[PDB]
């Protein structure tokens, strides 16, 4: 049995999972929190802690059939989109993408540096959350701005949750027992970040996040779509600095900005109790999601299936109901008994006669990344 | 009997002398190059007096023309002004405080107001606000998902624009269909120098593509439309640009011109047919964005009765319309090639007879709409 250690190294936390890519078992998963704040002063201590956690649950990486370490990198820009076997020269070049993701890319590079030191005798592979969307059609990838400026600074719609969108698209095809290449679908990844994609066969045609993960759907703390004039308006009238505005949009916006609620699951009870702010937050969220579904129906022209995924998409029946209600004339008919029934694994929530199928399809990014690592290393 | 409708900008003043009851323009024209070195029109006072002479020249002496009002176009009414408003000095004072919402367009409109009230004191002057139609957008559409206390303090919301055109076309679409407006759900696509879409349920708009300002939404002649707001921080950080330079780039050096260097669509067509790659890309980006708004608004409405194209491009460019709604048969839209290519310029059906959703071209007439708003608010 072979395993891949999949790592997500953040500024204050490091998430890991030791995954069997063949039969999909996680031997062990974990998170190291409060890095550099703490008993975990740096990422070196953090990875060592992860080793101790693995050991404590019975795993010896020396005996676990470890064949690769998979490193999650948020932003690969235009240059890194396939799973990439790491060496010193590639890692140097990865440093150049940091202006596209100044919060998230640097600590990933810290995780690579530490892991390559402590685990020098196995391959390390980077997987980029932008990668799936590298070959978006030019019509969807290109913003309508000054072309010379765009080219010089590599400005385009990059898109994120790429691993999840691709994985779920493949799993929806498997659920329907139809070749993926013949299917047109929409995937709704509704989690801490929220993004939508429109996918034809193996090729995405559009996706809701953009240059950065801020664009598109309303999210836990991110605004999604807003007039970019918000920045100059707030700078002029409120006297705010550009970085302050950007921080507000990324961290004090979305559901928390509108309602103060940090846990999406609390919204329902607050609404039921008559909290107007919670109702407004949920309505704004739902309205934006409805628009992206409609928009992507138009992009695709024909849509075979719509799938909900991630922490909210997989679990919140009200979200799913309110996202597609009143769209029977667009070919979407939900079966509320199925929508309400719960369950693990992929399942149909549309009525049997719905022209467009609607599914819940659980995502498993770590499994997908483990498989990517095995594939790029020889299979 | 007649209303002088004006649009007073920094460099030009557009006017039209309108007969609202016969739906006719008695006279139309423009004063250009306001304030220029060689120009005999140094300011807005001079500009308006020129317009008077022109009107005299085409048989209309303002003394015998039956002028009963002047309609003044104001881009932004904020949350304060959203119905046609009879102007006085108190109203004008309140209006000045809104200029941070439209710093380039509102001030020259207020200059036109001052001059016109002074030169034509015996007629009423009425302001019509391009944001007004959308004042009562539902909260889910009006509210951006940002810090609520901050949004309330600085009156940040989706305002929407081209309100006069969206409303008027929605009314004319209902008239074309011999159906009451209240019972209709529709999409209006205003494609001109600026481009915006709306979703309307009866007399109430449910959503519209422009936002806090006219930048948001569709790709336009020189405006980007939708883009990740991180573009500002990113360009300020990497390229060293100031915020105001980025905003200027997004408003003046973006859209079709940003992507192709072209100002038209007429020009775009021939560049495309001769094999120009930048022209094709620009048009593909425009078309993709417009298709998404159509789909988005179909979902907002749930049921849609009619989609209407309007303004300079929507009224005249059969390719734009074909590219915007082809391949949407499964969403209920079936375009008819022959009808779409028809040479006529009145309100007309371009969908196939059996299309579940009707598709129209409905010419806009913002000046007529405003002339009628003036008469109405004055009791006429």
XYZ file of N, CA, C and O in Angstrom, chain A residues 99-100 138-140 142-149 152-155 157 205-207 210-215 218-219 222-240 242-243 246 248-250 252-255 257-259 280 283-284 287-288 290-303 325-331, chain B residues 100-101 139-141 143-150 154-156 158 206-208 210-216 219-220 223-241 243-244 247 249-251 253-256 258-260 281 284-285 288-289 291-304 327-332 357:
696
model
N 3.138 38.209 -5.043
C 2.254 39.392 -5.154
C 0.820 39.059 -5.540
O -0.095 39.831 -5.236
N 0.611 37.916 -6.192
C -0.741 37.462 -6.501
C -1.436 36.871 -5.265
O -2.662 36.893 -5.185
N -10.354 32.380 -23.614
C -9.990 33.797 -23.545
C -11.163 34.742 -23.238
O -10.993 35.704 -22.483
N -12.341 34.451 -23.789
C -13.539 35.284 -23.560
C -13.931 35.366 -22.074
O -14.465 36.384 -21.621
N -13.664 34.301 -21.315
C -13.972 34.253 -19.879
C -12.775 34.639 -18.996
O -12.950 35.141 -17.880
N -10.259 36.822 -19.765
C -9.747 38.169 -20.009
C -10.700 39.224 -19.429
O -11.885 39.288 -19.804
N -10.201 40.044 -18.508
C -10.997 41.189 -18.058
C -10.974 42.248 -19.159
O -10.041 42.283 -19.981
N -12.005 43.087 -19.185
C -12.108 44.133 -20.181
C -11.426 45.382 -19.620
O -12.081 46.341 -19.230
N -10.098 45.323 -19.549
C -9.281 46.446 -19.107
C -8.169 46.691 -20.134
O -8.039 45.950 -21.123
N -7.408 47.757 -19.906
C -6.247 48.107 -20.730
C -5.364 46.882 -20.975
O -4.750 46.371 -20.041
N -5.305 46.427 -22.226
C -4.629 45.163 -22.577
C -3.130 45.161 -22.268
O -2.612 44.185 -21.710
N -2.440 46.255 -22.593
C -1.008 46.378 -22.295
C -0.752 46.274 -20.796
O 0.164 45.588 -20.358
N -1.587 46.930 -19.997
C -1.471 46.837 -18.549
C -1.728 45.396 -18.055
O -1.007 44.874 -17.184
N 1.253 43.073 -18.978
C 2.479 43.373 -18.230
C 2.443 42.826 -16.826
O 3.465 42.383 -16.304
N 1.267 42.861 -16.207
C 1.135 42.468 -14.822
C 0.391 41.143 -14.682
O 0.071 40.740 -13.576
N 0.179 40.454 -15.806
C -0.445 39.114 -15.836
C -1.801 39.090 -15.133
O -2.108 38.185 -14.343
N -2.598 40.108 -15.427
C -3.937 40.230 -14.869
C -4.901 39.437 -15.725
O -4.992 39.641 -16.942
N -8.605 36.464 -15.054
C -9.387 35.629 -14.154
C -8.631 34.324 -13.995
O -8.541 33.567 -14.956
N -15.419 26.383 -18.515
C -15.694 27.526 -19.391
C -15.734 28.854 -18.652
O -15.511 29.908 -19.258
N -16.056 28.819 -17.359
C -16.022 30.015 -16.510
C -16.019 29.581 -15.046
O -16.343 28.414 -14.710
N -15.637 30.503 -14.173
C -15.675 30.266 -12.755
C -15.729 31.617 -12.038
O -15.360 32.640 -12.615
N -11.720 35.166 -9.280
C -11.090 35.940 -10.358
C -9.586 36.011 -10.273
O -8.909 34.981 -10.199
N -9.062 37.236 -10.298
C -7.632 37.487 -10.087
C -7.203 36.872 -8.767
O -6.144 36.228 -8.673
N -8.055 37.069 -7.763
C -7.896 36.565 -6.416
C -9.183 35.835 -5.980
O -10.194 35.890 -6.682
N -9.171 35.195 -4.803
C -10.391 34.540 -4.315
C -11.519 35.449 -3.818
O -12.469 34.942 -3.233
N -11.417 36.765 -4.018
C -12.436 37.704 -3.551
C -13.670 37.773 -4.453
O -14.760 38.007 -3.962
N -13.503 37.563 -5.757
C -14.587 37.813 -6.700
C -15.654 36.719 -6.614
O -15.374 35.574 -6.201
N -21.026 35.551 -2.534
C -20.922 36.016 -1.178
C -20.306 34.859 -0.378
O -20.593 33.688 -0.651
N -19.454 35.181 0.586
C -18.765 34.130 1.368
C -18.826 34.459 2.851
O -19.453 35.448 3.242
N -15.871 37.291 2.855
C -15.540 37.972 1.597
C -16.806 38.498 0.906
O -17.860 37.844 0.900
N -16.693 39.696 0.344
C -17.844 40.366 -0.293
C -18.321 39.714 -1.578
O -19.491 39.854 -1.948
N -17.419 39.031 -2.278
C -17.672 38.665 -3.663
C -17.821 39.935 -4.501
O -17.301 40.994 -4.152
N -18.569 39.817 -5.583
C -18.788 40.889 -6.547
C -19.215 42.205 -5.890
O -20.160 42.249 -5.108
N -18.500 43.263 -6.244
C -18.879 44.621 -5.916
C -18.246 45.554 -6.944
O -17.167 45.259 -7.483
N -18.927 46.659 -7.232
C -18.348 47.751 -8.032
C -16.942 48.076 -7.514
O -16.792 48.402 -6.348
N -15.906 47.984 -8.375
C -14.545 48.311 -7.944
C -14.398 49.756 -7.485
O -13.439 50.074 -6.797
N -15.339 50.615 -7.878
C -15.400 52.000 -7.386
C -15.530 52.127 -5.869
O -15.267 53.205 -5.324
N -15.939 51.046 -5.193
C -15.956 51.002 -3.727
C -14.615 51.471 -3.125
O -14.595 52.153 -2.102
N -13.507 51.130 -3.777
C -12.178 51.460 -3.251
C -11.930 52.969 -3.309
O -11.637 53.590 -2.289
N -12.081 53.568 -4.486
C -11.865 55.010 -4.615
C -12.897 55.830 -3.835
O -12.561 56.887 -3.275
N -14.140 55.346 -3.780
C -15.191 55.986 -2.973
C -14.836 56.022 -1.484
O -14.880 57.093 -0.855
N -14.466 54.870 -0.929
C -14.057 54.794 0.482
C -12.767 55.571 0.777
O -12.627 56.160 1.855
N -11.838 55.564 -0.174
C -10.612 56.353 -0.048
C -10.939 57.844 -0.030
O -10.445 58.579 0.826
N -11.796 58.286 -0.946
C -12.190 59.697 -1.017
C -13.046 60.172 0.158
O -12.720 61.185 0.768
N -14.108 59.442 0.490
C -15.097 59.913 1.465
C -14.805 59.493 2.903
O -14.918 60.304 3.823
N -14.457 58.228 3.101
C -14.149 57.714 4.442
C -12.686 57.923 4.842
O -12.327 57.670 5.986
N -11.843 58.351 3.904
C -10.414 58.534 4.176
C -9.638 57.244 4.410
O -8.561 57.260 5.015
N -10.167 56.123 3.921
C -9.513 54.829 4.111
C -8.373 54.636 3.110
O -8.412 55.167 2.000
N -6.095 52.120 0.615
C -6.434 51.019 -0.294
C -6.337 49.647 0.367
O -7.192 48.792 0.137
N -5.311 49.437 1.190
C -5.122 48.138 1.849
C -6.165 47.894 2.928
O -6.580 46.752 3.152
N -9.268 46.801 0.997
C -9.070 45.418 0.556
C -9.206 44.425 1.717
O -9.782 43.338 1.561
N -10.969 44.999 4.483
C -12.389 45.046 4.857
C -13.202 44.083 3.969
O -14.039 43.310 4.465
N -12.928 44.135 2.668
C -13.610 43.278 1.678
C -13.310 41.795 1.865
O -14.175 40.953 1.631
N -12.084 41.482 2.284
C -11.679 40.089 2.496
C -12.010 39.498 3.862
O -12.187 38.287 3.966
N -13.976 41.487 6.699
C -15.090 42.069 7.444
C -16.300 42.298 6.537
O -17.089 43.223 6.744
N -16.440 41.430 5.543
C -17.515 41.516 4.566
C -18.259 40.188 4.513
O -18.186 39.397 5.459
N -19.007 39.946 3.434
C -19.765 38.713 3.293
C -20.798 38.556 4.382
O -21.370 39.548 4.844
N -21.021 37.316 4.819
C -22.016 37.046 5.858
C -21.683 37.768 7.180
O -22.576 38.302 7.835
N -19.871 40.535 7.648
C -20.056 41.972 7.463
C -21.508 42.414 7.568
O -21.808 43.462 8.139
N -22.413 41.610 7.020
C -23.825 41.946 7.023
C -24.547 41.599 8.320
O -25.521 42.255 8.658
N -24.092 40.569 9.040
C -24.861 40.041 10.183
C -24.082 39.848 11.496
O -24.690 39.609 12.541
N -31.153 39.297 6.112
C -30.582 40.075 5.002
C -29.317 39.419 4.459
O -29.143 39.310 3.243
N -30.338 36.359 2.501
C -30.984 36.766 1.245
C -29.961 37.234 0.206
O -30.039 36.869 -0.963
N -28.999 38.039 0.635
C -27.935 38.533 -0.254
C -27.096 37.365 -0.787
O -26.802 37.269 -1.980
N -29.374 35.331 -3.291
C -29.596 36.086 -4.543
C -28.380 36.007 -5.484
O -28.524 35.730 -6.675
N -27.185 36.197 -4.937
C -25.943 36.129 -5.720
C -25.741 34.727 -6.283
O -25.355 34.573 -7.423
N -28.080 32.402 -6.906
C -29.072 32.252 -7.980
C -28.595 32.857 -9.296
O -28.696 32.210 -10.329
N -28.037 34.064 -9.251
C -27.490 34.699 -10.458
C -26.382 33.914 -11.132
O -26.352 33.827 -12.368
N -25.463 33.368 -10.340
C -24.375 32.581 -10.919
C -24.880 31.294 -11.550
O -24.381 30.890 -12.588
N -25.884 30.664 -10.958
C -26.492 29.467 -11.581
C -27.105 29.815 -12.942
O -26.797 29.191 -13.969
N -27.956 30.836 -12.951
C -28.548 31.352 -14.192
C -27.515 31.731 -15.234
O -27.641 31.364 -16.427
N -26.493 32.475 -14.805
C -25.435 32.899 -15.718
C -24.747 31.721 -16.372
O -24.477 31.737 -17.590
N -24.461 30.690 -15.579
C -23.750 29.551 -16.115
C -24.625 28.615 -16.934
O -24.125 27.966 -17.873
N -25.928 28.564 -16.650
C -26.865 27.917 -17.583
C -26.762 28.548 -18.971
O -26.772 27.854 -19.995
N -26.680 29.877 -19.004
C -26.535 30.596 -20.270
C -25.190 30.320 -20.952
O -25.149 30.118 -22.178
N -24.097 30.324 -20.187
C -22.768 30.023 -20.726
C -22.768 28.631 -21.391
O -22.284 28.447 -22.510
N -23.339 27.654 -20.702
C -23.303 26.267 -21.179
C -24.304 25.984 -22.312
O -24.056 25.133 -23.170
N -25.432 26.687 -22.300
C -26.519 26.494 -23.265
C -27.342 25.250 -22.978
O -28.563 25.318 -22.864
N -26.654 24.111 -22.890
C -27.235 22.869 -22.388
C -26.468 22.456 -21.142
O -25.239 22.435 -21.168
N -27.193 22.153 -20.062
C -26.613 21.737 -18.780
C -27.206 20.391 -18.379
O -28.423 20.238 -18.310
N -34.938 27.291 -6.352
C -36.408 27.338 -6.338
C -36.891 28.279 -7.426
O -36.212 29.247 -7.788
N -38.070 27.999 -7.973
C -38.660 28.890 -8.960
C -37.962 28.852 -10.311
O -38.181 29.736 -11.144
N -37.158 27.812 -10.559
C -36.437 27.698 -11.821
C -36.910 26.503 -12.664
O -36.202 26.033 -13.560
N -38.131 26.049 -12.437
C -38.637 24.916 -13.211
C -38.699 25.233 -14.705
O -38.475 24.364 -15.538
N -38.948 26.490 -15.057
C -38.993 26.865 -16.467
C -37.603 26.934 -17.092
O -37.487 26.999 -18.307
N -36.561 26.930 -16.265
C -35.184 26.818 -16.743
C -34.658 25.376 -16.680
O -33.495 25.132 -16.993
N -35.519 24.436 -16.306
C -35.182 23.017 -16.347
C -34.730 22.392 -15.035
O -34.258 21.250 -15.044
N -20.158 63.588 -4.257
C -19.165 62.513 -4.046
C -19.599 61.159 -4.666
O -18.765 60.267 -4.866
N -20.892 61.007 -4.966
C -21.397 59.809 -5.633
C -21.231 59.858 -7.160
O -21.201 58.801 -7.813
N -33.960 44.608 -1.053
C -32.721 44.666 -0.244
C -31.649 43.643 -0.659
O -30.465 43.957 -0.632
N -32.060 42.448 -1.077
C -31.102 41.419 -1.514
C -30.312 41.829 -2.756
O -29.192 41.359 -2.959
N -30.889 42.702 -3.585
C -30.208 43.215 -4.770
C -29.508 44.545 -4.515
O -28.493 44.825 -5.122
N -28.195 45.671 -1.641
C -27.205 45.645 -0.570
C -25.983 44.855 -0.998
O -26.090 43.649 -1.328
N -24.814 45.493 -0.975
C -23.561 44.744 -1.154
C -23.211 43.999 0.140
O -23.583 44.434 1.254
N -22.496 42.879 -0.001
C -22.110 42.082 1.151
C -20.812 42.628 1.718
O -19.758 42.008 1.582
N -20.897 43.797 2.354
C -19.745 44.412 3.022
C -20.122 44.801 4.456
O -21.263 44.625 4.869
N -19.152 45.321 5.202
C -19.380 45.825 6.554
C -20.608 46.723 6.590
O -20.628 47.778 5.968
N -21.626 46.306 7.332
C -22.934 46.983 7.304
C -22.900 48.405 7.883
O -23.540 49.315 7.352
N -22.136 48.600 8.953
C -22.076 49.905 9.614
C -21.405 50.905 8.683
O -21.875 52.037 8.543
N -20.347 50.454 8.011
C -19.631 51.257 7.023
C -20.535 51.601 5.828
O -20.571 52.753 5.374
N -21.777 55.658 4.840
C -21.435 56.314 3.586
C -22.430 56.010 2.464
O -22.166 56.308 1.301
N -23.588 55.459 2.824
C -24.678 55.275 1.881
C -24.246 54.460 0.652
O -24.534 54.810 -0.504
N -23.551 53.366 0.935
C -23.095 52.442 -0.097
C -24.193 51.413 -0.387
O -24.622 50.678 0.504
N -26.152 49.312 -4.214
C -26.294 49.260 -5.655
C -27.347 50.310 -5.996
O -28.491 50.171 -5.582
N -36.157 44.293 -10.046
C -35.597 43.341 -9.077
C -34.064 43.344 -9.032
O -33.458 42.949 -8.026
N -33.417 43.734 -10.126
C -31.960 43.826 -10.158
C -31.534 44.636 -11.361
O -32.280 44.775 -12.324
N -30.321 45.158 -11.308
C -29.747 45.854 -12.460
C -28.236 45.777 -12.398
O -27.662 45.579 -11.323
N -25.532 47.884 -13.334
C -24.695 48.938 -12.772
C -24.914 49.030 -11.272
O -25.882 48.479 -10.730
N -24.000 49.705 -10.583
C -23.881 49.529 -9.140
C -23.921 50.815 -8.349
O -24.799 51.647 -8.551
N -22.987 50.938 -7.418
C -22.700 52.201 -6.741
C -22.483 53.318 -7.746
O -22.926 54.450 -7.538
N -21.787 52.981 -8.826
C -21.505 53.864 -9.938
C -21.809 53.144 -11.262
O -22.093 51.936 -11.271
N -21.726 53.873 -12.395
C -21.973 53.250 -13.686
C -20.869 52.303 -14.179
O -20.942 51.845 -15.311
N -19.856 52.005 -13.364
C -18.759 51.133 -13.814
C -19.144 49.646 -13.852
O -18.680 48.891 -14.724
N -19.968 49.232 -12.896
C -20.252 47.814 -12.673
C -21.093 47.213 -13.786
O -21.883 47.917 -14.439
N -19.635 44.797 -20.025
C -18.536 45.437 -20.756
C -19.139 46.602 -21.552
O -20.227 46.463 -22.110
N -18.450 47.740 -21.578
C -18.947 48.927 -22.285
C -17.869 49.494 -23.219
O -16.824 48.879 -23.415
N -15.551 51.328 -20.294
C -15.661 50.862 -18.906
C -15.524 49.345 -18.823
O -16.073 48.614 -19.645
N -14.807 48.886 -17.807
C -14.529 47.458 -17.636
C -15.767 46.625 -17.320
O -15.855 45.475 -17.726
N -16.718 47.193 -16.588
C -17.766 46.368 -15.998
C -17.156 45.533 -14.880
O -16.122 45.907 -14.307
N -17.791 44.398 -14.593
C -17.380 43.512 -13.509
C -15.902 43.182 -13.559
O -15.385 42.777 -14.597
N -15.245 43.356 -12.419
C -13.879 42.893 -12.230
C -13.632 42.727 -10.734
O -14.216 43.436 -9.914
N -12.787 41.763 -10.377
C -12.332 41.600 -8.998
C -11.903 42.942 -8.447
O -11.000 43.587 -9.006
N -12.508 43.367 -7.331
C -12.077 44.627 -6.746
C -10.608 44.655 -6.308
O -10.055 45.736 -6.136
N -9.994 43.486 -6.148
C -8.559 43.383 -5.861
C -7.678 43.999 -6.948
O -6.493 44.208 -6.727
N -8.244 44.267 -8.121
C -7.511 44.928 -9.186
C -6.871 46.239 -8.688
O -5.753 46.582 -9.097
N -7.563 46.949 -7.797
C -7.074 48.238 -7.314
C -5.834 48.052 -6.442
O -4.785 48.621 -6.739
N -5.962 47.264 -5.376
C -4.837 46.967 -4.492
C -3.673 46.360 -5.273
O -2.509 46.722 -5.060
N -3.981 45.438 -6.184
C -2.932 44.773 -6.968
C -2.145 45.751 -7.846
O -0.916 45.723 -7.848
N -2.846 46.613 -8.579
C -2.172 47.590 -9.434
C -1.433 48.665 -8.625
O -0.372 49.128 -9.044
N -1.987 49.054 -7.479
C -1.337 50.034 -6.615
C -0.050 49.442 -6.025
O 0.958 50.141 -5.883
N -0.079 48.149 -5.715
C 1.076 47.456 -5.146
C 2.177 47.130 -6.145
O 3.351 47.380 -5.866
N 1.812 46.558 -7.287
C 2.810 46.093 -8.250
C 3.235 47.216 -9.198
O 4.423 47.506 -9.317
N 2.258 47.861 -9.839
C 2.526 48.939 -10.800
C 2.739 50.309 -10.154
O 3.116 51.256 -10.835
N 2.484 50.430 -8.856
C 2.665 51.711 -8.159
C 1.637 52.789 -8.487
O 1.853 53.962 -8.170
N 0.519 52.404 -9.114
C -0.535 53.364 -9.483
C -1.266 53.887 -8.246
O -1.370 53.198 -7.227
N -4.882 55.084 -6.489
C -6.275 54.634 -6.597
C -7.000 55.358 -7.728
O -7.638 54.729 -8.561
N -6.867 56.681 -7.778
C -7.622 57.480 -8.743
C -7.205 57.195 -10.187
O -8.023 57.316 -11.104
N -8.967 53.852 -10.978
C -10.380 54.164 -11.256
C -10.539 54.811 -12.633
O -11.427 54.447 -13.401
N -8.516 54.479 -15.238
C -8.222 53.438 -16.218
C -9.475 52.560 -16.439
O -9.842 52.258 -17.580
N -10.135 52.191 -15.343
C -11.322 51.313 -15.411
C -12.528 51.994 -16.081
O -13.327 51.343 -16.742
N -12.637 53.309 -15.925
C -13.714 54.089 -16.554
C -13.435 54.574 -17.980
O -14.364 54.691 -18.785
N -10.134 53.833 -19.981
C -9.176 53.071 -20.792
C -9.432 51.559 -20.734
O -8.512 50.756 -20.883
N -10.698 51.189 -20.559
C -11.091 49.797 -20.431
C -12.204 49.448 -21.415
O -12.376 50.127 -22.425
N -12.934 48.364 -21.163
C -13.986 47.944 -22.067
C -13.477 47.627 -23.460
O -12.358 47.133 -23.631
N -14.303 47.916 -24.460
C -13.957 47.610 -25.845
C -12.679 48.334 -26.279
O -11.816 47.720 -26.911
N -10.211 49.508 -24.338
C -9.100 48.913 -23.609
C -8.584 47.642 -24.269
O -7.370 47.421 -24.331
N -9.500 46.833 -24.804
C -9.133 45.538 -25.384
C -8.754 45.601 -26.878
O -7.961 44.779 -27.342
N -9.326 46.554 -27.620
C -9.151 46.609 -29.080
C -8.625 47.937 -29.637
O -8.200 47.987 -30.798
N -11.482 39.482 -29.947
C -11.383 39.189 -28.512
C -12.261 40.130 -27.727
O -13.019 39.704 -26.824
N -15.798 39.143 -28.221
C -16.093 37.886 -27.508
C -16.271 38.108 -25.992
O -17.171 37.531 -25.372
N -15.417 38.938 -25.400
C -15.485 39.291 -23.974
C -16.807 40.030 -23.683
O -17.514 39.710 -22.715
N -19.696 37.407 -24.055
C -19.738 36.473 -22.908
C -20.372 37.104 -21.657
O -21.231 36.498 -21.004
N -19.961 38.330 -21.337
C -20.493 39.047 -20.184
C -21.996 39.284 -20.314
O -22.741 39.111 -19.346
N -24.186 37.560 -22.231
C -24.887 36.262 -22.092
C -25.068 35.863 -20.614
O -26.121 35.352 -20.241
N -24.051 36.093 -19.775
C -24.167 35.769 -18.357
C -25.235 36.593 -17.649
O -25.992 36.047 -16.843
N -25.318 37.895 -17.959
C -26.343 38.747 -17.337
C -27.742 38.320 -17.733
O -28.633 38.314 -16.897
N -27.930 37.923 -18.987
C -29.208 37.428 -19.431
C -29.599 36.197 -18.625
O -30.718 36.124 -18.106
N -28.685 35.224 -18.524
C -28.954 34.010 -17.747
C -29.216 34.301 -16.277
O -30.150 33.748 -15.696
N -28.397 35.189 -15.686
C -28.527 35.588 -14.292
C -29.918 36.157 -14.036
O -30.563 35.804 -13.066
N -30.390 37.010 -14.935
C -31.694 37.656 -14.758
C -32.887 36.739 -15.069
O -33.945 36.859 -14.437
N -32.713 35.777 -15.971
C -33.696 34.689 -16.097
C -33.900 33.956 -14.766
O -35.038 33.612 -14.390
N -32.809 33.708 -14.048
C -32.883 33.036 -12.750
C -33.500 33.934 -11.688
O -34.261 33.459 -10.842
N -33.181 35.228 -11.719
C -33.777 36.180 -10.776
C -35.291 36.228 -10.948
O -36.028 36.182 -9.960
N -35.750 36.325 -12.190
C -37.174 36.412 -12.488
C -37.933 35.094 -12.307
O -39.112 35.098 -11.913
N -37.275 33.972 -12.608
C -37.909 32.655 -12.507
C -38.744 32.350 -13.728
O -38.472 31.395 -14.458
N -39.765 33.171 -13.944
C -40.502 33.199 -15.192
C -40.231 34.535 -15.889
O -40.329 35.595 -15.261
N -39.906 34.481 -17.177
C -39.673 35.702 -17.972
C -40.599 35.724 -19.175
O -40.686 34.749 -19.922
N -28.360 29.973 -29.072
C -27.970 28.848 -28.238
C -28.599 28.869 -26.852
O -28.018 28.330 -25.911
N -29.777 29.489 -26.725
C -30.518 29.516 -25.445
C -31.919 28.939 -25.575
O -32.824 29.251 -24.757
N -32.095 28.051 -26.556
C -33.409 27.424 -26.803
C -33.902 26.661 -25.574
O -35.105 26.664 -25.285
N -32.987 26.020 -24.847
C -33.341 25.286 -23.631
C -33.671 26.207 -22.449
O -34.165 25.741 -21.439
N -33.385 27.496 -22.567
C -33.813 28.473 -21.579
C -35.093 29.215 -22.021
O -35.556 30.121 -21.317
N -35.648 28.828 -23.173
C -36.933 29.361 -23.661
C -36.842 30.463 -24.705
O -37.856 31.104 -25.015
N -40.173 32.651 -24.599
C -39.881 34.033 -24.203
C -39.876 34.916 -25.447
O -39.163 34.638 -26.420
